CSV table of C-alpha atoms in Angstrom, one decimal:
chain,number,residue,atom,x,y,z
A,17,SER,CA,-68.6,-48.8,40.3
A,18,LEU,CA,-68.4,-49.7,36.6
A,19,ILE,CA,-67.9,-46.7,34.3
A,20,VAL,CA,-68.3,-46.9,30.5
A,21,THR,CA,-67.3,-43.8,28.6
A,22,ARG,CA,-66.4,-43.1,25.0
A,23,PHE,CA,-65.1,-40.5,22.6
A,24,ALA,CA,-67.5,-40.0,19.7
A,25,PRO,CA,-66.6,-36.7,18.1
A,26,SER,CA,-68.7,-34.9,15.5
A,27,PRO,CA,-67.4,-34.9,12.0
A,28,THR,CA,-64.0,-33.1,11.8
A,29,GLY,CA,-61.0,-33.2,9.5
A,30,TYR,CA,-58.5,-33.9,12.4
A,31,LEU,CA,-58.3,-34.1,16.2
A,32,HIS,CA,-58.8,-30.7,17.8
A,33,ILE,CA,-57.1,-29.9,21.1
A,34,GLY,CA,-60.6,-29.2,22.5
A,35,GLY,CA,-61.7,-32.7,21.5
A,36,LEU,CA,-58.5,-34.1,22.9
A,37,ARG,CA,-59.3,-32.5,26.2
A,38,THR,CA,-62.8,-34.1,26.2
A,39,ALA,CA,-61.3,-37.4,25.3
A,40,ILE,CA,-58.9,-37.2,28.2
A,41,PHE,CA,-61.6,-36.5,30.7
A,42,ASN,CA,-63.7,-39.4,29.4
A,43,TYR,CA,-60.5,-41.5,29.3
A,44,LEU,CA,-59.5,-40.6,32.9
A,45,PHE,CA,-62.9,-41.3,34.3
A,46,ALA,CA,-62.9,-44.8,32.9
A,47,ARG,CA,-59.3,-45.6,33.8
A,48,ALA,CA,-59.5,-44.1,37.4
A,49,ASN,CA,-62.4,-46.5,38.2
A,50,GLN,CA,-61.0,-49.4,36.1
A,51,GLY,CA,-63.8,-49.0,33.5
A,52,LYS,CA,-63.9,-49.1,29.8
A,53,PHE,CA,-63.1,-46.4,27.2
A,54,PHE,CA,-64.1,-46.6,23.6
A,55,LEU,CA,-63.4,-44.6,20.4
A,56,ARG,CA,-66.2,-44.2,17.9
A,57,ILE,CA,-65.7,-42.6,14.5
A,58,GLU,CA,-68.9,-41.1,12.9
A,59,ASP,CA,-68.4,-41.2,9.1
A,60,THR,CA,-71.7,-39.9,7.6
A,61,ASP,CA,-70.5,-41.2,4.2
A,62,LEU,CA,-67.8,-43.5,2.9
A,63,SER,CA,-66.1,-40.9,0.8
A,64,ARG,CA,-62.3,-40.4,0.4
A,65,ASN,CA,-62.5,-37.1,2.4
A,66,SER,CA,-64.0,-38.8,5.5
A,67,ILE,CA,-61.6,-41.8,5.3
A,68,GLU,CA,-58.5,-39.6,5.6
A,69,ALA,CA,-60.2,-37.6,8.4
A,70,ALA,CA,-60.8,-40.8,10.4
A,71,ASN,CA,-57.1,-41.9,9.9
A,72,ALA,CA,-56.0,-38.5,11.1
A,73,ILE,CA,-58.0,-38.8,14.3
A,74,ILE,CA,-56.6,-42.3,14.8
A,75,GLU,CA,-53.1,-41.1,14.1
A,76,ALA,CA,-53.2,-38.3,16.7
A,77,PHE,CA,-54.8,-40.7,19.2
A,78,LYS,CA,-51.9,-43.2,18.8
A,79,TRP,CA,-49.3,-40.5,19.2
A,80,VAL,CA,-50.9,-39.1,22.4
A,81,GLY,CA,-51.1,-42.6,23.8
A,82,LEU,CA,-54.8,-42.8,24.9
A,83,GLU,CA,-55.5,-46.5,24.5
A,84,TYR,CA,-59.1,-47.7,24.0
A,85,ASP,CA,-60.9,-50.9,24.8
A,86,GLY,CA,-62.1,-53.2,22.0
A,87,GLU,CA,-62.0,-52.1,18.4
A,88,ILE,CA,-63.0,-48.8,16.8
A,89,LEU,CA,-66.7,-48.5,15.9
A,90,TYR,CA,-67.6,-46.8,12.6
A,91,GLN,CA,-70.9,-45.3,11.5
A,92,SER,CA,-70.6,-46.8,8.0
A,93,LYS,CA,-70.4,-50.3,9.4
A,94,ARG,CA,-73.6,-49.9,11.4
A,95,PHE,CA,-75.9,-48.7,8.6
A,96,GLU,CA,-78.7,-51.3,9.1
A,97,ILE,CA,-78.8,-50.8,12.8
A,98,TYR,CA,-79.7,-47.1,12.6
A,99,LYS,CA,-82.3,-47.8,9.9
A,100,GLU,CA,-84.3,-50.3,12.1
A,101,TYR,CA,-84.6,-47.9,15.1
A,102,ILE,CA,-85.8,-45.1,12.7
A,103,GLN,CA,-88.3,-47.5,11.3
A,104,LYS,CA,-89.4,-48.5,14.8
A,105,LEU,CA,-90.2,-44.9,15.7
A,106,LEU,CA,-92.2,-44.6,12.5
A,107,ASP,CA,-94.2,-47.7,13.2
A,108,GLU,CA,-94.9,-46.5,16.7
A,109,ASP,CA,-95.9,-43.0,15.3
A,110,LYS,CA,-93.2,-41.4,17.4
A,111,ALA,CA,-91.6,-40.2,14.2
A,112,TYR,CA,-93.2,-39.0,11.0
A,113,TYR,CA,-92.5,-38.1,7.4
A,114,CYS,CA,-92.2,-34.4,6.6
A,115,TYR,CA,-92.3,-32.8,3.1
A,116,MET,CA,-92.3,-29.1,4.1
A,117,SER,CA,-89.3,-26.9,3.8
A,118,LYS,CA,-87.7,-25.2,6.8
A,119,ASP,CA,-89.1,-21.8,5.7
A,120,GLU,CA,-92.6,-23.3,5.7
A,121,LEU,CA,-92.2,-24.8,9.1
A,122,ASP,CA,-90.6,-21.6,10.6
A,123,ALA,CA,-93.8,-19.7,9.6
A,124,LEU,CA,-96.1,-22.4,10.8
A,125,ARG,CA,-94.3,-22.8,14.2
A,126,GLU,CA,-94.7,-19.0,14.8
A,127,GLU,CA,-98.5,-19.0,14.0
A,128,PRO,CA,-100.2,-38.2,-0.9
A,129,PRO,CA,-97.2,-36.0,-1.9
A,130,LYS,CA,-95.6,-36.8,-5.2
A,131,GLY,CA,-91.9,-36.6,-6.0
A,132,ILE,CA,-90.5,-34.8,-3.0
A,133,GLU,CA,-88.4,-37.2,-0.8
A,134,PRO,CA,-89.4,-36.5,2.8
A,135,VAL,CA,-87.3,-36.4,5.9
A,136,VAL,CA,-88.1,-38.1,9.2
A,137,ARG,CA,-88.7,-35.9,12.2
A,138,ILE,CA,-89.2,-36.9,15.9
A,139,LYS,CA,-92.4,-35.9,17.6
A,140,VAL,CA,-91.4,-33.9,20.7
A,141,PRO,CA,-94.0,-34.2,23.4
A,142,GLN,CA,-95.1,-30.6,24.0
A,143,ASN,CA,-95.9,-29.1,27.5
A,144,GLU,CA,-93.3,-31.1,29.3
A,145,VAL,CA,-90.1,-30.2,31.2
A,146,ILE,CA,-86.9,-32.0,30.3
A,147,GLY,CA,-84.5,-32.0,33.2
A,148,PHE,CA,-81.2,-33.6,34.0
A,149,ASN,CA,-78.8,-33.2,36.9
A,150,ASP,CA,-75.5,-32.3,35.3
A,151,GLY,CA,-72.4,-33.1,37.2
A,152,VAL,CA,-70.9,-29.6,36.7
A,153,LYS,CA,-73.8,-27.3,36.1
A,154,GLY,CA,-76.3,-29.0,38.4
A,155,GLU,CA,-80.0,-29.2,37.5
A,156,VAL,CA,-80.7,-28.2,34.0
A,157,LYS,CA,-84.4,-27.8,32.9
A,158,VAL,CA,-85.8,-26.9,29.5
A,159,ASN,CA,-89.4,-26.7,28.3
A,160,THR,CA,-90.2,-29.0,25.4
A,161,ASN,CA,-92.1,-26.1,23.8
A,162,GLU,CA,-88.7,-24.6,23.2
A,163,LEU,CA,-87.8,-27.7,21.1
A,164,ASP,CA,-89.2,-28.2,17.7
A,165,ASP,CA,-89.6,-31.5,15.8
A,166,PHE,CA,-86.0,-32.0,14.8
A,167,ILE,CA,-84.8,-34.2,12.0
A,168,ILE,CA,-83.5,-37.7,12.8
A,169,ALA,CA,-83.2,-38.9,9.2
A,170,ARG,CA,-82.4,-37.0,6.0
A,171,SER,CA,-84.3,-37.4,2.8
A,172,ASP,CA,-81.8,-40.1,1.6
A,173,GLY,CA,-82.5,-42.0,4.9
A,174,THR,CA,-79.1,-41.2,6.5
A,175,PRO,CA,-79.5,-40.7,10.3
A,176,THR,CA,-78.4,-37.4,11.9
A,177,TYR,CA,-75.5,-37.0,14.3
A,178,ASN,CA,-77.7,-36.9,17.4
A,179,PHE,CA,-79.5,-40.1,16.5
A,180,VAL,CA,-76.2,-42.1,15.8
A,181,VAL,CA,-74.8,-41.0,19.1
A,182,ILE,CA,-77.7,-42.1,21.3
A,183,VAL,CA,-78.1,-45.4,19.5
A,184,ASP,CA,-74.4,-46.2,19.8
A,185,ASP,CA,-74.4,-45.0,23.5
A,186,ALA,CA,-77.3,-47.3,24.4
A,187,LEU,CA,-75.9,-50.3,22.5
A,188,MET,CA,-72.4,-49.9,24.1
A,189,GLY,CA,-73.8,-49.3,27.7
A,190,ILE,CA,-72.4,-45.8,28.0
A,191,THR,CA,-72.9,-44.7,31.7
A,192,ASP,CA,-71.4,-41.2,31.7
A,193,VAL,CA,-70.7,-38.5,29.1
A,194,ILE,CA,-68.3,-35.6,29.8
A,195,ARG,CA,-69.0,-32.9,27.2
A,196,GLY,CA,-68.2,-29.3,26.4
A,197,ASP,CA,-70.7,-26.5,27.0
A,198,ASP,CA,-70.7,-26.0,23.2
A,199,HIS,CA,-73.0,-29.1,22.7
A,200,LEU,CA,-75.2,-28.2,25.7
A,201,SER,CA,-78.2,-27.6,23.4
A,202,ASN,CA,-77.9,-31.1,21.8
A,203,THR,CA,-78.4,-32.7,25.2
A,204,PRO,CA,-82.2,-32.1,25.6
A,205,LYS,CA,-82.6,-33.3,22.0
A,206,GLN,CA,-80.7,-36.5,22.8
A,207,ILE,CA,-82.8,-37.0,26.0
A,208,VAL,CA,-85.9,-36.9,23.7
A,209,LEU,CA,-84.4,-39.7,21.5
A,210,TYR,CA,-83.4,-41.7,24.6
A,211,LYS,CA,-86.9,-41.6,26.2
A,212,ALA,CA,-88.6,-42.3,22.8
A,213,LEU,CA,-86.6,-45.5,22.4
A,214,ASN,CA,-86.9,-46.5,26.0
A,215,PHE,CA,-83.1,-46.2,26.5
A,216,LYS,CA,-81.2,-45.5,29.7
A,217,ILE,CA,-80.0,-41.9,30.0
A,218,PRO,CA,-76.3,-41.7,31.0
A,219,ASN,CA,-75.0,-39.0,33.3
A,220,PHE,CA,-73.8,-35.8,31.8
A,221,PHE,CA,-70.9,-33.5,32.7
A,222,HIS,CA,-70.7,-30.2,30.8
A,223,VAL,CA,-67.4,-28.4,31.1
A,224,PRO,CA,-66.8,-24.8,29.9
A,225,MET,CA,-65.1,-24.4,26.6
A,226,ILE,CA,-61.4,-23.5,26.4
A,227,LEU,CA,-60.7,-19.7,26.1
A,228,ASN,CA,-57.8,-18.0,24.4
A,229,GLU,CA,-55.6,-15.3,25.9
A,230,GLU,CA,-58.2,-12.6,25.3
A,231,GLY,CA,-61.1,-14.6,26.7
A,232,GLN,CA,-62.5,-15.4,23.3
A,233,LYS,CA,-63.6,-18.9,22.3
A,234,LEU,CA,-60.8,-21.1,21.1
A,235,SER,CA,-61.2,-21.5,17.4
A,236,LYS,CA,-59.2,-21.8,14.1
A,237,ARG,CA,-58.6,-18.1,14.2
A,238,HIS,CA,-55.9,-18.7,16.9
A,239,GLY,CA,-53.9,-20.9,14.5
A,240,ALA,CA,-53.1,-24.0,16.7
A,241,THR,CA,-56.0,-26.4,17.1
A,242,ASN,CA,-54.6,-29.5,15.4
A,243,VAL,CA,-53.0,-31.9,17.9
A,244,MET,CA,-50.4,-33.0,15.3
A,245,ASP,CA,-49.3,-29.4,14.9
A,246,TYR,CA,-48.1,-29.5,18.5
A,247,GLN,CA,-46.0,-32.6,17.6
A,248,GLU,CA,-44.4,-30.7,14.7
A,249,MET,CA,-43.8,-27.7,17.0
A,250,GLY,CA,-41.7,-29.9,19.3
A,251,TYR,CA,-44.1,-30.6,22.3
A,252,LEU,CA,-43.9,-33.9,24.1
A,253,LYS,CA,-47.1,-36.0,24.4
A,254,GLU,CA,-46.8,-36.0,28.2
A,255,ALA,CA,-46.7,-32.2,28.4
A,256,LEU,CA,-49.6,-31.8,26.0
A,257,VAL,CA,-51.8,-34.1,28.2
A,258,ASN,CA,-50.7,-32.4,31.4
A,259,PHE,CA,-51.5,-29.0,29.9
A,260,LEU,CA,-55.0,-29.9,28.6
A,261,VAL,CA,-56.2,-31.8,31.7
A,262,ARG,CA,-55.4,-28.7,33.8
A,263,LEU,CA,-57.9,-26.6,31.8
A,264,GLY,CA,-61.1,-26.8,33.7
A,265,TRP,CA,-59.8,-29.2,36.3
A,266,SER,CA,-57.7,-28.7,39.4
A,267,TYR,CA,-56.5,-31.0,42.2
A,268,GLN,CA,-54.7,-29.5,45.2
A,269,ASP,CA,-52.8,-26.5,43.8
A,270,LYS,CA,-50.6,-29.0,41.8
A,271,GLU,CA,-49.5,-28.3,38.2
A,272,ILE,CA,-47.4,-31.2,37.1
A,273,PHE,CA,-49.0,-34.6,37.0
A,274,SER,CA,-47.9,-38.1,35.9
A,275,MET,CA,-50.1,-40.5,34.0
A,276,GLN,CA,-50.2,-42.7,37.1
A,277,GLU,CA,-51.0,-39.8,39.4
A,278,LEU,CA,-54.0,-38.6,37.2
A,279,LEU,CA,-55.3,-42.2,37.0
A,280,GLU,CA,-55.2,-42.3,40.9
A,281,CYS,CA,-56.7,-38.8,41.7
A,282,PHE,CA,-58.9,-37.7,38.8
A,283,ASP,CA,-62.6,-37.1,39.8
A,284,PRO,CA,-65.2,-35.5,37.5
A,285,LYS,CA,-66.7,-33.9,40.6
A,286,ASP,CA,-63.6,-31.6,40.5
A,287,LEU,CA,-64.4,-30.2,37.1
A,288,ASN,CA,-64.4,-26.4,37.4
A,289,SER,CA,-67.5,-24.6,36.3
A,290,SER,CA,-65.2,-21.5,35.6
A,291,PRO,CA,-63.8,-21.3,32.1
A,292,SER,CA,-60.0,-21.7,31.8
A,293,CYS,CA,-57.7,-19.8,29.4
A,294,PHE,CA,-55.1,-21.2,27.0
A,295,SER,CA,-51.7,-20.0,28.1
A,296,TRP,CA,-48.6,-20.4,25.9
A,297,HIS,CA,-46.4,-19.7,28.9
A,298,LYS,CA,-48.0,-22.5,31.0
A,299,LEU,CA,-47.7,-25.0,28.1
A,300,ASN,CA,-44.0,-24.1,27.5
A,301,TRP,CA,-43.4,-24.3,31.2
A,302,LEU,CA,-44.8,-27.8,31.3
A,303,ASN,CA,-43.0,-28.8,28.1
A,304,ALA,CA,-39.7,-27.4,29.4
A,305,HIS,CA,-40.2,-29.6,32.5
A,306,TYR,CA,-40.9,-32.9,30.7
A,307,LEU,CA,-38.1,-32.2,28.2
A,308,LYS,CA,-35.6,-31.6,31.0
A,309,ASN,CA,-36.7,-34.8,32.8
A,310,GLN,CA,-35.9,-36.9,29.8
A,311,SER,CA,-32.9,-39.1,29.3
A,312,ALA,CA,-30.1,-38.9,26.8
A,313,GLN,CA,-30.8,-41.8,24.5
A,314,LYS,CA,-34.5,-40.8,24.3
A,315,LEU,CA,-33.6,-37.2,23.5
A,316,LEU,CA,-31.5,-38.5,20.6
A,317,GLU,CA,-34.5,-40.3,19.1
A,318,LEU,CA,-36.8,-37.3,19.8
A,319,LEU,CA,-34.5,-34.8,18.2
A,320,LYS,CA,-33.9,-36.8,15.1
A,321,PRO,CA,-36.8,-35.4,13.0
A,322,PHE,CA,-35.8,-31.8,14.1
A,323,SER,CA,-32.0,-31.7,14.0
A,324,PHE,CA,-30.1,-31.3,10.7
A,325,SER,CA,-27.0,-32.8,12.3
A,326,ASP,CA,-26.5,-36.5,12.8
A,327,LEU,CA,-25.3,-37.5,16.3
A,328,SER,CA,-22.2,-39.7,16.0
A,329,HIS,CA,-20.5,-38.2,19.1
A,330,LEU,CA,-19.3,-40.0,22.3
A,331,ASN,CA,-21.2,-40.2,25.6
A,332,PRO,CA,-19.4,-37.1,27.0
A,333,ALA,CA,-19.3,-35.3,23.7
A,334,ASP,CA,-24.0,-35.6,26.6
A,335,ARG,CA,-22.3,-32.3,27.4
A,336,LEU,CA,-24.0,-30.7,24.4
A,337,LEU,CA,-27.4,-31.3,26.0
A,338,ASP,CA,-26.4,-30.1,29.4
A,339,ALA,CA,-26.1,-26.5,28.3
A,340,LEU,CA,-29.0,-26.4,25.9
A,341,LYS,CA,-31.6,-28.4,27.9
A,342,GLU,CA,-32.2,-25.6,30.5
A,343,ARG,CA,-32.5,-22.9,27.8
A,344,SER,CA,-34.9,-24.7,25.5
A,345,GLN,CA,-38.6,-25.3,25.7
A,346,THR,CA,-39.5,-27.4,22.7
A,347,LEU,CA,-37.7,-30.0,20.5
A,348,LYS,CA,-37.7,-27.5,17.7
A,349,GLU,CA,-35.8,-24.9,19.8
A,350,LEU,CA,-33.5,-27.5,21.3
A,351,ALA,CA,-32.5,-29.0,17.9
A,352,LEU,CA,-31.9,-25.5,16.4
A,353,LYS,CA,-29.4,-24.6,19.2
A,354,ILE,CA,-27.8,-28.0,18.6
A,355,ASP,CA,-27.4,-27.3,14.9
A,356,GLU,CA,-25.8,-24.0,15.9
A,357,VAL,CA,-22.9,-26.0,17.4
A,358,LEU,CA,-22.6,-29.1,15.3
A,359,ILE,CA,-23.1,-27.5,11.9
A,360,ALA,CA,-20.0,-25.5,10.8
A,361,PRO,CA,-20.6,-21.8,10.2
A,362,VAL,CA,-21.0,-20.7,6.6
A,363,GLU,CA,-20.9,-16.9,7.4
A,364,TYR,CA,-19.7,-14.6,10.2
A,365,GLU,CA,-21.6,-12.0,12.0
A,366,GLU,CA,-20.6,-8.7,10.5
A,367,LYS,CA,-21.8,-6.8,13.6
A,368,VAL,CA,-18.8,-8.1,15.6
A,369,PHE,CA,-16.5,-9.0,12.7
A,370,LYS,CA,-16.2,-5.5,11.2
A,371,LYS,CA,-15.3,-4.1,14.7
A,372,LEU,CA,-12.2,-6.3,15.1
A,373,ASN,CA,-8.5,-5.5,14.5
A,374,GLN,CA,-7.7,-8.0,11.7
A,375,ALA,CA,-3.9,-7.4,12.1
A,376,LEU,CA,-4.0,-8.5,15.8
A,377,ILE,CA,-6.8,-11.1,15.8
A,378,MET,CA,-5.3,-13.3,13.0
A,379,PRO,CA,-1.9,-14.2,14.6
A,380,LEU,CA,-3.5,-14.5,18.1
A,381,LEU,CA,-5.8,-17.3,16.9
A,382,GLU,CA,-2.8,-19.1,15.4
A,383,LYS,CA,-0.9,-19.1,18.7
A,384,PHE,CA,-3.8,-20.7,20.4
A,385,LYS,CA,-4.4,-23.2,17.6
A,386,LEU,CA,-1.0,-24.8,18.2
A,387,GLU,CA,-1.3,-24.5,22.0
A,388,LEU,CA,-4.6,-26.5,21.9
A,389,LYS,CA,-3.4,-29.0,19.3
A,390,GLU,CA,-0.9,-30.4,21.8
A,391,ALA,CA,-3.8,-31.1,24.2
A,392,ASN,CA,-6.9,-33.2,23.6
A,393,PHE,CA,-10.0,-34.4,25.4
A,394,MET,CA,-10.8,-31.1,30.1
A,395,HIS,CA,-8.8,-28.1,31.2
A,396,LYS,CA,-8.5,-25.3,28.6
A,397,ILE,CA,-5.6,-22.8,28.2
A,398,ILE,CA,-5.5,-19.0,28.6
A,399,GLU,CA,-3.5,-16.6,26.5
A,400,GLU,CA,-0.8,-14.7,28.5
A,401,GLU,CA,-0.1,-11.8,26.1
A,402,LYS,CA,-1.2,-9.4,28.8
A,403,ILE,CA,-4.6,-8.7,27.2
A,404,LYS,CA,-8.2,-9.0,28.5
A,405,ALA,CA,-10.1,-12.2,28.0
A,406,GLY,CA,-12.6,-10.4,25.7
A,407,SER,CA,-9.9,-9.5,23.2
A,408,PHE,CA,-9.3,-13.2,22.7
A,409,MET,CA,-12.7,-14.9,23.5
A,410,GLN,CA,-14.7,-12.8,21.0
A,411,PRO,CA,-12.7,-13.7,17.9
A,412,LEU,CA,-12.4,-17.3,18.9
A,413,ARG,CA,-16.2,-17.5,19.3
A,414,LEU,CA,-16.7,-16.1,15.8
A,415,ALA,CA,-14.3,-18.7,14.4
A,416,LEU,CA,-16.1,-21.6,16.2
A,417,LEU,CA,-19.7,-20.5,16.4
A,418,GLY,CA,-20.0,-17.4,14.2
A,419,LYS,CA,-22.7,-15.9,16.4
A,420,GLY,CA,-22.4,-13.5,19.4
A,421,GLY,CA,-24.0,-15.2,22.4
A,422,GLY,CA,-24.0,-19.0,22.2
A,423,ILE,CA,-22.6,-21.8,24.3
A,424,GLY,CA,-19.4,-21.4,26.3
A,425,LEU,CA,-16.1,-21.9,24.4
A,426,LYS,CA,-14.9,-24.5,26.9
A,427,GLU,CA,-17.7,-26.9,26.1
A,428,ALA,CA,-17.8,-26.2,22.4
A,429,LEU,CA,-14.2,-27.2,22.1
A,430,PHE,CA,-14.9,-30.6,23.7
A,431,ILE,CA,-18.2,-31.2,22.0
A,432,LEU,CA,-16.7,-30.5,18.6
A,433,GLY,CA,-13.9,-32.7,17.4
A,434,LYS,CA,-10.3,-31.6,17.9
A,435,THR,CA,-9.9,-31.8,14.1
A,436,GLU,CA,-13.2,-30.0,13.6
A,437,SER,CA,-12.2,-27.2,15.9
A,438,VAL,CA,-9.0,-26.6,13.9
A,439,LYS,CA,-11.0,-26.8,10.7
A,440,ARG,CA,-13.3,-24.0,11.8
A,441,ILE,CA,-10.4,-21.7,13.0
A,442,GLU,CA,-8.6,-22.3,9.7
A,443,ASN,CA,-11.7,-21.3,7.7
A,444,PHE,CA,-11.9,-18.1,9.7
A,445,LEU,CA,-8.3,-17.2,8.7
A,446,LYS,CA,-9.0,-17.8,5.0
């Protein structure tokens, strides 16, 4: 069966994670059945603010990797198309000109003009039942008496969002629409427009909105709704998609999915009607997994915008990533731990430095400096001055790493250059 879906978001300044989730559902439905998936940008005006917003949505779309068929459709490039359908409804007396204000209509609905530019409103047939079988909620019915004559064209002639969606959906042959429960009230209004223009009504799937940790609606008050913020936070594109597709959808008790697995087992009949919650632990658990399943060369290219240290080390000097990969969850956390090893310490932790015998620690490091200088690149040496390991390992760690609980001293000596290790010990003695 041929499936034609799209992603036509309402005007936003960027790509929201909630909109990314909806775009994934619509994407997966088309790709699972070898259909077509489009991206439509609805710019109500050709201003500088809306041009940058469109580029931002396209930017996040490219980074995530959701490819679309054909070229991107813009609302500003289809101005004359929307005008003709609006005129058609007028000439058929299915739409009419209105000069009243909203406050006048609110009072009248509860009980040759000169100058004033009118708006165009659609004539909603009263005393009818608008119904549609939603793929998630089931049969949804609404009386037309609960729908007033809504605006389809403003006083300057510009069509509304609902009119632009249904025209573009009919001209593109959209067969299914997977939507969030937020826009559930716009669906009956779109159905009116569809029937008025004798257009085919695609199938609808209304999924619950994403909830936060406290069960509230996911909004800008949480502080992480822009998809490109997750890129700056250090999350991989594969982990972000795996996280969002799991909200409101579940297969067979599985948590990790590849792109080829989703494309071969996604089904909109499995969309859960129970709302899902946004979990930082779940997203980090996924992102830790995809980060650990990466290679070594790819990690070098991923860690470049996050690490202050340039990687000119040898293939074994991959040992740096072995110890930090398991203890890191994002590229930001991984690169920071890397900088804690490659970048030389500028200061020393006074919590452990002040509680150290300076008369005994200084000559002991020198005896090890020469003992290690004879060796090179991987068996280390142990001091034999009849002392515990802590009496020697704690000062050596402060000289090499400066902190209290970092990587093991055996790996840090090999990761760092044999000349760099001596340069750090000599700086500790100064």
